[PDB]
Amino acid sequence: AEMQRKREDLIKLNTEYKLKLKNLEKRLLEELNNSQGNMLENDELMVTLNNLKKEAMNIEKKLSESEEFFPQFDNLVEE
Amino acid sequence: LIHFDRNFYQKMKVGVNPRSPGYFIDGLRALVKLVTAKYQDLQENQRFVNVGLEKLNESVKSLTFEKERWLNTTKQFSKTSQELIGNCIISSIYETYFGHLNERERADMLVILKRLLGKFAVKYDVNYRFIDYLVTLDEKMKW
Structure with missing residues (x-):
């Protein structure tokens, strides 16, 4: 049950963290352009x-x- | 692709030798459409990390030196691109030849495809999933 549980989250958190990695990269670069002359x-x-x-x-x-x-x-899978 | 089409009819179809190349054509046309679409997206993400490389070099507090480390990804890209040609081969065959096959019939043909990809000088993603590869998470939810 522990490896079937971790199977679904393994491809889920693969895409979720990479969505969040590209979501936080966009948060970072948009504030770096807005707050360059600001604080x-x-x-x-x-x-x-x-x-x-x-x-x-x-x-x-x-x-x-x-x-x-x-x-x-x-x-x-074989057994 | 020739060795795949020759294997597809040989393994899957019964009824006496009536039928011939049609999938082969659509398979090839899919690959070209998909490699062009993948090359444009790999160059887009490489342009997204090139713009972040110039942004960090302008700045140079304790953590910013690791984002060079986040930058390593830079080396990763070339390896990721070398497999995208053979990855598109599997994707096009799924789109073309697999539609009408059984759970078992799909996996089985995938083996014969992957070992054909293994003998020829093309690199493919070891952890490959057709869903994840061509579907976007927004589409996948929407369906």
Whole structure:
């Protein structure tokens, strides 16, 4: 039950975090153009970009375990 | 593609040798339509990371040096592009030849396709899913 549970979220969080990676890249570049001559607002998104250090590397956390999960899943298909 | 079409009729169809190349044509026409659409989208994302590379170089507080690290992705692209030609091959065959096949009949042919892709000098994505590859999450929800 633990690997069937993690199967659905593995391709889900793959696309969700990459949607959020491209959603936060757009949040970052639009405020960097708006608050360049204005105050250090980008900092208020940089603490959300500090949260992204989990997110960008969460992908790398999940890709590392994928190389472990997929060959196990394909081994379970045969039985 | 020739070795796939020759294998498709050989494995899937019964009834006596009546029928001939039609899928082959539509398969080829799909690939061209899809590679052009994929090359335009890979160059678009590479233009999106080139614009972010010039934005960080203008700035150069503790974390910004890692976004060069976020920048590494830069090396990733070339590997991602080398598989997009063979990835489009599978996508076009699914669009063309698979429509009328069974769950088992689809997977089975996919094997014969993938091992044909394995012997020829084309690179394909090991973790490949036809849904994820051509559907957008907005469409997928909408359906």
